[PDB]
Amino acid sequence: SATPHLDAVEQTLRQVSPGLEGDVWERTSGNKLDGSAADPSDWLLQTPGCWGDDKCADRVGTKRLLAKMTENIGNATRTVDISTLAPFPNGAFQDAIVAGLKESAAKGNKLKVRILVGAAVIPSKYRDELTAKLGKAAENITLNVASMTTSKTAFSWNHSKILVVDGQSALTGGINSWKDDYLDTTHPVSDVDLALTGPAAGSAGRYLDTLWTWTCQNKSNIASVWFAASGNAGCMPTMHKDTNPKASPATGNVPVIAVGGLGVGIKDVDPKSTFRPDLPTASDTKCVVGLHDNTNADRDYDTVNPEESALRALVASAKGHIEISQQDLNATCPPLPRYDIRLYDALAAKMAAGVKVRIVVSDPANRGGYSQIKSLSEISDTLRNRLANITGGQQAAKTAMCSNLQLATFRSSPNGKWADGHPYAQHHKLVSVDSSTFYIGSKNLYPSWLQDFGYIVESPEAAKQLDAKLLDPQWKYSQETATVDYARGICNA
Ligand code: WO5
């Protein structure tokens, strides 16, 4: 196979969540990473993209992200489908959406549009604001806007950040459309989306139909859903299926696995799954005895959240090296368990076999929204303890870890903080293996029980562009904070 990593992941997903294939996860061929002729790596919609400069003067990343949002929407002929985490898009994010919608309306197109947010008056106000800003272009648009909560007790609601146009183009990643955190600030959050086209955009459209089908079903229950539409328009549970081809056109040669999760409160189990996991044991992840742990001790939860298993399978597929860039690997407990045991066990299995692991997280000084640990020791201790189970003791665990781990906090320039004195915040949900296959999406590696979505792309060419444009500049500046770095013999943990 040309695609050993996807092959492995796909075999896992089909055992975990067979009934969700097509809708919540899906393998496709024939896609394209959607970069420009001039800078073919600029499918990689990183922000801010001001490497080396503690003042972030030239934000080539941000500029390209907003331009690409506008360009994709402006090319719509039928549908625009947006999900994010509340608040609703504002600032220049909202401006980009408005500009795109006006452009499409001026090219003669009549559009259906869905905008869905997860959250803990807002929707109708956002609809009205958008409608006002569109002017005459609003006459062309059938709009649905909604906020939703699927479980109050599991803190479950939409967390995906997706923009799909005509079922053909898709932008997704970790970026919320929040002007204060990303744009109008001298300490912008560092994050990444990707832009693709092809059948894998269809996959995202079918994922969004899954969420909207639940949302429209629950639209009269105020505790669950707040819905607003333009004119006399109804809720559109299946806009994608109804408006776009099931057979999405091919655009390139890139193979992709789309994968998401349904969180808690949409669907409790995949009734088709016969998955029978070995559930790891004995860790110190559950800080309190009362907590129900969906991440580590709920088989049914896995079957409706294939993304957790997909990310653990991506790690397990690595033959040489794994790079992980996250806000955090660990969650705040309560209400969540501190870590995903199976993920740390998969990383430990890899280091024990000499596969190199790099983890870069957000500076704990953020705490200090954008960090959930006090110290990198909270990561290294856990990896060491899980390594001890398979290397025969704590000493052999520490040696394996020091010979195979790079663990650090993020910086984007030579300075320990931004020039304005605020720590760098990082929010990527990024995993790359073997300079071959990578995940970009909204699903954090720390325990979380939300509706999420992302893509796993197997393309050494694209993975090399990801190295040059993101992971290499990240390590260049971030390596100075490392507590463990096998490449320089640092072992302070
Ligand atoms: O949008 W998210 O965990 O990646 O709530 O900060």
Side-chain angles (χ1 to χ4, degrees), residues 1-70 72-109 111-493:
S1 195
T3 59
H5 302 88
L6 295 184
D7 287 358
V9 172
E10 176 178 27
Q11 288 203 328
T12 293
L13 297 188
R14 191 162 300 111
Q15 291 186 109
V16 176
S17 306
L20 297 186
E21 183 171 6
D23 294 301
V24 182
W25 74 270
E26 184 175 39
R27 179 166 180 163
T28 59
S29 68
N31 300 289
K32 186 188 195 305
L33 297 176
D34 197 13
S36 63
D39 207 359
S41 66
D42 72 11
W43 59 265
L44 181 67
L45 302 179
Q46 67 178 296
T47 182
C50 65
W51 297 103
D53 179 9
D54 68 358
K55 304 165 294 316
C56 212
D58 191 9
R59 313 195 181 179
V60 298
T62 303
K63 291 178 191 195
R64 166 69 188 165
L65 166 69
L66 296 171
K68 186 52 169 174
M69 290 174 59
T70 300
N72 277 11
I73 297 169
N75 286 335
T77 66
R78 309 184 294 276
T79 63
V80 176
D81 218 348
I82 301 176
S83 63
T84 186
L85 184 68
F88 283 100
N90 72 349
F93 290 111
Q94 178 77 341
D95 301 336
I97 294 164
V98 168
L101 294 177
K102 285 185 146 286
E103 164 66 335
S104 176
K107 285 153 163 171
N109 303 292
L111 302 181
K112 293 175 188 163
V113 176
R114 296 194 300 195
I115 301 169
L116 184 66
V117 304
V121 305
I122 305 181
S124 52
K125 176 181 184 159
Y126 178 80
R127 178 206 54 198
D128 294 338
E129 282 170 11
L130 193 50
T131 285
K133 277 158 171 215
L134 288 164
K136 180 178 180 180
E139 100 189 357
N140 280 42
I141 291 159
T142 298
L143 177 62
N144 281 187
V145 173
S147 190
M148 61 82 114
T149 296
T150 62
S151 181
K152 179 162 146 184
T153 59
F155 303 96
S156 192
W157 47 71
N158 182 62
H159 182 263
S160 68
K161 305 103 172 48
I162 312 173
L163 164 63
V164 193
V165 173
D166 297 336
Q168 246 168 233
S169 69
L171 306 193
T172 200
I175 299 167
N176 294 306
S177 293
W178 300 348
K179 86 187 174 56
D180 296 316
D181 283 355
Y182 290 90
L183 303 187
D184 183 3
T185 175
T186 41
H187 48 272
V189 172
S190 293
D191 207 335
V192 66
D193 284 4
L194 73 62
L196 59 67
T197 61
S203 306
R206 279 183 284 289
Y207 175 79
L208 287 171
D209 275 1
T210 306
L211 298 192
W212 271 99
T213 285
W214 180 90
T215 298
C216 293
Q217 286 163 349
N218 288 272
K219 74 181 196 288
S220 297
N221 180 6
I222 304 162
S224 289
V225 170
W226 296 98
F227 172 84
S230 59
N232 297 325
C235 199
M236 298 183 282
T238 54
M239 180 187 74
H240 180 80
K241 173 182 175 184
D242 297 342
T243 315
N244 296 320
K246 185 185 173 162
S248 275
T251 57
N253 64 8
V254 183
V256 174
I257 292 172
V259 61
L262 297 178
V264 180
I266 295 179
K267 175 172 189 182
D268 57 81
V269 63
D270 170 13
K272 315 309 182 149
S273 181
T274 56
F275 175 54
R276 289 317 162 177
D278 267 47
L279 302 176
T281 352
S283 72
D284 63 333
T285 188
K286 209 165 77 144
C287 62
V288 165
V289 294
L291 301 176
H292 181 68
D293 186 341
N294 294 127
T295 298
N296 301 306
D298 196 310
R299 175 265 185 192
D300 285 2
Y301 173 94
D302 281 307
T303 74
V304 291
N305 286 281
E307 59 189 355
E308 266 92 339
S309 290
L311 288 158
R312 295 191 294 244
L314 175 63
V315 166
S317 78
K319 72 169 192 213
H321 61 95
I322 297 162
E323 296 78 55
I324 288 171
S325 183
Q326 303 278 314
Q327 186 189 292
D328 287 289
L329 241 51
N330 299 0
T332 293
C333 186
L336 276 297
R338 279 206 308 115
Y339 63 92
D340 182 329
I341 301 163
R342 283 175 287 183
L343 171 68
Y344 272 83
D345 276 345
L347 295 168
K350 287 285 155 178
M351 292 190 287
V355 171
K356 301 298 177 294
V357 167
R358 175 181 302 153
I359 298 158
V360 177
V361 295
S362 201
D363 180 355
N366 278 289
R367 270 158 56 257
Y370 292 94
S371 173
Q372 299 171 98
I373 53 171
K374 295 158 202 256
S375 160
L376 296 170
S377 65
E378 292 172 54
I379 296 170
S380 54
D381 291 341
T382 307
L383 283 168
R384 193 204 46 248
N385 295 333
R386 299 319 289 187
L387 267 164
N389 293 169
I390 64 167
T391 56
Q394 288 282 322
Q395 185 183 274
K398 191 189 189 59
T399 296
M401 175 169 83
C402 287
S403 307
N404 291 287
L405 177 68
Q406 283 174 331
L407 176 62
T409 58
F410 172 69
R411 305 177 179 178
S412 61
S413 83
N415 192 339
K417 300 185 299 156
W418 287 110
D420 72 4
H422 287 252
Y424 300 102
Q426 166 166 277
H427 195 240
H428 314 107
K429 295 93 171 75
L430 173 65
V431 177
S432 184
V433 307
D434 296 336
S435 294
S436 160
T437 302
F438 54 92
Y439 175 90
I440 293 177
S442 69
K443 182 54 168 172
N444 296 291
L445 283 177
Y446 59 79
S448 42
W449 302 335
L450 316 166
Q451 295 82 45
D452 274 308
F453 184 82
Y455 294 115
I456 302 173
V457 174
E458 181 149 17
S459 176
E461 175 192 308
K464 284 163 193 171
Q465 291 168 344
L466 170 66
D467 287 334
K469 302 304 290 189
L470 198 158
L471 285 170
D472 294 347
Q474 165 181 78
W475 189 247
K476 176 180 178 208
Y477 303 112
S478 303
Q479 65 185 274
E480 283 308 308
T481 65
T483 52
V484 179
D485 184 351
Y486 76 84
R488 298 175 300 148
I490 304 176
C491 181
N492 299 323

